[PDB]
Amino acid sequence: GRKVTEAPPFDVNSLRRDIEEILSEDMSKGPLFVRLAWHEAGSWDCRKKDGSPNSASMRFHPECSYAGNKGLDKGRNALESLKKKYPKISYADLWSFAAVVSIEAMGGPEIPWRWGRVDAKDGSVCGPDGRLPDASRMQDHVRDVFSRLGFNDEETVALIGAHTCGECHLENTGYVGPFTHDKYGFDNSFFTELFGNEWMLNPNVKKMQFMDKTTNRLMMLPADVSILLDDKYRSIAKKYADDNDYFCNAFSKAYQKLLEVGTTDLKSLPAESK
Ligand code: HEM
Ligand code: NA
Ligand code: NA
C-alpha cells in the first residue's frame, strides 16, 4: 500500500484551467464528462476483477458501441485537443480529471484525484455488455449492478445523486429532459426534486419516463423513482435531501472510489498541484 506523492508529467494546474475554460464556453460538457468517467469505471466487476475500468477502454470496440455509452463520443472528442496539448496524460487520467474538475466547477465538492491510470491499447481488454445500469429497470437491478461494482447502498444512492446535473437526450438514450431546474449545479437537489414532486407518466416519450406534476419540465427514469419504492434506498435519499454537506461528502468519497476501481500504482498530487 503506502501513499506515493509525485508531480505528474503534465502541468495539472494549467490542465485544470483549460478544462474550466471549456466548461465556461459550453456548460453542457460538465455533466457529459461526469457521465464519461462514470461509464469508463462502470464496466468493473469487483468479483471477476475484469471490465478494464479506468483505462479508457471505451475508446475501443465493442465497449464504445454498447447502448449504455451512446453519446459519449461527444465527451471523448471534446478532450482530444487537451490530449494533444498535454500528451503525457493518459486518456484515463484526462477523463477522470475532467469529471472531478467539472463537479468542482458546478459548485460541487472538491474531489481528491490521483494520477497514474494506464490506457487500454486494444479492444481485447473490454469486458462484456450489460455492466452499465438499465434505466428501464427498478431497485433490484440497481442494487445488482452497484453491488457488482463493489458499492454499498449509501454509496449507490450518493452516486445516483449525480443526476442533480445534466439531462437526457432522445438521440443518445431515448430519454428526454433534465432531472432538476438547475442542471449545471452540483448539489442534493436531485433528492429535493425526487421527494418534492408527484411523478407521472410522460405520454410523449416512447421509452417509459416520468415528469413532475408541477411543471412537466423535470424527468425521472424508472430506475431513479425506484429509489422512492425501495425502503432502504428511500431512507438514505431522505438523509441526502435533508443535508447537502452530508450528500456532497458521501458523493466525493464514492466518486473517488469509482474513478479508482481496478487501478494500481496511483500517485497523489504535491500540495500546490491538488
Ligand atoms: C441507476 C443508475 C443510473 C442509470 C440508469 C443512469 C441513466 C442515465 C441516463 C439514461 C442518462 C441520460 C444520458 C443521455 O441521454 O445523454 C444519464 C445521464 C447522466 N448520468 Fe446517469 N444513470 C445512472 C447512474 C449514474 C451515475 C452513477 C452517475 C455518476 C456518478 C451518472 C451521471 C449522469 C450524468 C452526469 C448525466 C447527464 C449527462 C449529460 O448531461 O450529458 N449516472 N444517466
Ligand atoms: Na472501461
Ligand atoms: Na442541480
Residue numbers in the entry: 55 to 328
Task: Quote the passages of the study that discuss this structure, keeping the authors' original sentences.
TcAPx-CcP has high sequence identity to members of the class I peroxidase family, notably ascorbate peroxidase (APX) and cytochrome c peroxidase (CcP), as well as a mitochondrial peroxidase from Leishmania major (LmP). Like LmP, TcAPx was later found to have both ascorbate and cytochrome c activity and was thus renamed as TcAPx-CcP.
On the proximal side there is a typical peroxidase His217-Asp278-Trp233 proximal triad, as observed in yeast CcP and in soybean APX (sAPX, His163-Asp208-Trp179). This broadening was clearly absent in parallel experiments at 4 K on the W233F variant. The low temperature EPR spectra support the formation of a reactive compound I intermediate with an exchange-coupled [Fe(IV)=O Trp233•+] radical.
